Design a protein around this ligand. Structure first.
Ligand SMILES: Nc1nc2c(ncn2[C@@H]2O[C@H](COP(=O)(O)OP(=O)(O)NP(=O)(O)O)[C@@H](O)[C@H]2O)c(=O)[nH]1
Ligand SMILES: Clc1cccc(Nc2nc(NCc3ccco3)c3ccccc3n2)c1
Ligand SMILES: [Mg+2]
Ligand code: NA
Lengths: 166, 469, 167
């Protein structure tokens, strides 16, 4: 059993915790309880190989923005999450991307771009704009709903595959 | 340079690390031992977060620190003094200018705010995942509410207001799937006819499914508070470990029910059908990763009354002997193959709890509470980490729900199963063994014949599921 | 090569039974233990000049899984029946443990030893004469052990191996 260290990052309120709890417990969290730092474990078979996912769920509120280097050092792959009805959260993605690259001193960090809340009709970030950004990073783009489970396994398990092939 | 710290005289958590107060194991450090002050410092350290450590500490700390004292210590940790103006700040103020306050601003951003946020994260985890401390001590809850409710200043405000709401919700205190659960299966007993429910009349697939839902729920209900301190073995076990004991008593009752079904079927041909049906239920348990259920069956087959029934075992089909043998081999060599299989499958599963209990008990009995170093007694934290590795493994398998539909009548049937009746354990297990001797006497006594007891067909419907449109 | 003996520890829970095997298998001289470690329950020893391997099954903590006792006992060639010298109920339980072993092994003469374990400083309630009389009535040895000083621990296990060898 290989162990994988995944880290979920992105602006406050985009659904990092809801995505993680949906993956771990098959439950959608309606409350908005801002995270400081939480961690979860999940044994799961991916492409026929059993592994153990360690998932770090991080703080998106700006008041915690000076405490990120410590978790970026330990992570092996990053889910970069924005919400498709929140343009500012999309504009915040590049700041996370650049900080991860700096901390890990690498242009080649496993990452997946995640556009969450895709169950909501009132989209303000178009798929094409997010896909263009993902291509510029060399990473896949996956739209998700923590509420319906759409895309959730795909997002996390795609990240595992990119760590595996790293 | 490193930030300067408050004087250790006014703030105890600024004392330098030494082997008289903290010992590390041989890229964050791992703590072997330390004083409670040093443990709390590293629990809320300014340089890094350690969420595993938070879980480990909150799961195990009561063996070395009382809940009331922990709260006092983290409040003390939170109240960090700010440094005085520096010489450059002084000279600016003397000229009527605003000081740069560079050292003060850095200390706020890189020491006070991270430590305070990490203290709040301890409080948040304490309330969310270890709320029993507050259920059992209402004054502790009042103190926590007062502390959180009086934190001032905007940097912590979002988390203070959130934690206040979380506490209030915990005081007065839904699943979604990738697919639909399979259709409930029926055999001789039809829906609603609970009076005919029995081992051979319910569908063996649905027996295994409903027992797996029941045993998964029982597994998922056990909290670490029922395990730390080995409290399920002590005199107050019924008070401190009720969910664990309910889970074990279900397992014991099902094993005894299997044995009773076997030995009370005196006709040889019927008893072969009973044993074969139980092995089919075991096959579905294996398919569902219900290892508790697997061992429930294996324990029954290895029991003194059943294991000796050579005439019955002789007629069990070879493919079913192989299923039972594979299941028995999971337990051999101190559960070597079981442990490997548990770590290889795709959850949901229902682990066998007994191995966890033995490992927690032996870890707590086999390691000292303190280490003596340089005349000081340090808390042996490595021992607590080992216990929390086990409780963490337990919790990891409690997360995944089964995609199976409850059948309320079949569920009630197995919840109310009571093979022992009003009999005490010795009286009942002696009865089972004497029944075994009656139906297959010791050699050289001849094998008697017995009349049939079942009026319905004995042929199994099998354990492959069906699917109408 | 060398003979392996499958030994099984049985007895009441909650009264320090596990200290017997822990103290044996331990780094005798460093008070430490990881029971999850592959072969934390196997020990090569020399008894009367003959090297052998002890495999010890101690399911301490699983006492409430009472319908599993037969399964666990079936694995053993020799048995340590353990009670606590400050718990009279654990001493009274011994008779039923021995009867259950005889039934599982289908023998009236199963290698076994009676072990009286001192698990703390609480007052003794089973005197050594009571336990000696019980052991004699069964025809088996009696060994007293301390859960803290390792006294008697080697004697308990080595005596059982001698009972197996002389069966
Ligand atoms: N409709 C919908 N709501 C969602 C979805 N994901 C999260 N939410 C909602 O958005 C809010 C914030 O979710 P949360 O998981 O706490 O976000 P976060 O990114 O973890 N916040 P923070 O960075 O402060 O920890 C909650 O009310 C939650 O129910 C989604 O996919 N769809
Ligand atoms: Cl009725 C009934 C039902 C099941 C088993 C038995 N009797 C039985 N079973 C054996 N192996 C199967 C197994 C694996 C775990 C437990 O049993 C066995 C092997 C060697 C010598 C004798 C044996 N006797 C009787
Ligand atoms: Mg969050
Ligand atoms: Na007593």
């Amino acid at each position: 059993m290989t162990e994988y260290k995944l880290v979920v990052v992105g602006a406050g309120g985009v659904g990092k915790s809801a995505l993680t709890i949906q993956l771990i417990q098959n439950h959608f969290v309606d409350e908005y309880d801002p995270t400081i730092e939480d961690s979860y474990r999940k044994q799961v078979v991916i492409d026929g190989e059993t592994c153990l996912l360690d998932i770090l769920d991080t703080a998106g509120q700006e008041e915690a923005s000076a405490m990120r280097d410590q978790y970026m050092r330990t992570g092996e792959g990053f889910l970069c999450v924005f919400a498709i009805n929140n343009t500012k959260s999309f504009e915040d993605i590049h700041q996370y991307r650049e900080q991860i690259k700096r901390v890990k001193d690498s242009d080649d960090v496993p990452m997946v771009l995640v556009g969450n809340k895709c169950d909501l009709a009132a989209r303000t970030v178009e798929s094409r704009q997010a896909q263009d950004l993902a291509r510029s990073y060399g990473i896949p783009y996956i739209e998700t709903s923590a509420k319906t489970r759409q895309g959730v396994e795909d997002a996390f398990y795609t990240l595992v595959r990119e760590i595996r092939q790293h | 340079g490193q930030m300067r710290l408050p004087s250790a005289d006014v703030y105890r958590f600024a004392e330098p690390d030494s082997e008289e107060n903290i010992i590390f194991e041989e890229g964050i450090p791992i703590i072997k031992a330390g004083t409670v002050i040093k443990l709390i410092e590293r629990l809320t350290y300014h340089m890094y977060a350690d969420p595993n450590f938070v879980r480990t500490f909150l799961t195990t700390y009561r063996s070395f620190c009382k809940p009331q004292e922990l709260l006092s210590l983290i409040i003390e940790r939170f109240e960090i003094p700010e440094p005085e103006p520096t010489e450059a700040d002084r000279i600016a103020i003397e000229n009527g200018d605003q000081p740069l306050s560079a050292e003060l601003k850095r200390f706020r951003k890189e020491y006070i705010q991270p430590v305070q946020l990490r203290v709040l994260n301890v409080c948040r985890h304490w309330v969310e995942h270890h709320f029993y401390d507050f259920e059992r001590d209402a004054y502790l809850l009042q103190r926590m509410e007062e502390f959180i409710g009086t934190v001032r200043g905007k940097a912590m405000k979002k988390w203070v207001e959130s934690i206040t709401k979380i506490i209030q919700r915990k005081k007065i205190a839904n699943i979604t799937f990738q697919s639909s659960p399979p259709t409930v299966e029926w055999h001789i007993s039809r829906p609603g006819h609970i009076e005919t429910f029995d081992l051979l009349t319910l569908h063996p697939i649905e027996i295994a499914r409903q027992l797996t839902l029941l045993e998964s729920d029982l597994y998922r209900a056990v909290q670490p508070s029922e395990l730390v301190g080995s409290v399920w073995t002590k005199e107050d076990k019924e008070i401190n470990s009720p969910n664990l004991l309910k889970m074990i008593r279900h397992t014991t009752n099902l094993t005894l029910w299997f044995e009773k079904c076997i030995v009370e079927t005196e006709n040889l041909e019927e008893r072969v059908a009973v044993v074969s049906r139980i092995i089919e239920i075991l096959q579905v348990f294996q398919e569902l990763n219900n290892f508790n259920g697997v061992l429930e069956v294996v324990s029954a087959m290895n029991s003194s009354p059943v294991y000796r029934l050579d005439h019955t075992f002789e007629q069990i089909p070879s493919r079913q002997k192989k299923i039972l043998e594979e299941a028995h081999e999971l337990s051999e060599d101190h559960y070597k193959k079981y442990l490997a299989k548990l770590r290889s499958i795709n959850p949901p599963c229902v682990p066998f709890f007994g191995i966890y209990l033995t490992n927690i008990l032996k870890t707590e009995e086999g390691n000292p509470e303190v280490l003596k170093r340089h005349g000081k007694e340090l808390i042996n934290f490595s021992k607590r980490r080992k216990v929390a590795e086990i409780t963490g493994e337990i919790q990891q398998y409690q997360n995944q729900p089964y995609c199976l539909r409850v059948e309320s009548d079949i569920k009630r049937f197995f919840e109310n199963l009571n093979p022992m009746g009003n009999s005490m354990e010795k009286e009942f297990t002696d009865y089972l063994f004497n029944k075994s001797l009656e139906i297959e006497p010791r050699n050289p006594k001849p094998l008697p014949r017995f009349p049939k007891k079942y009026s319905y067909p004995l042929k199994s419907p099998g354990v492959r599921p069906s699917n109408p449109r």
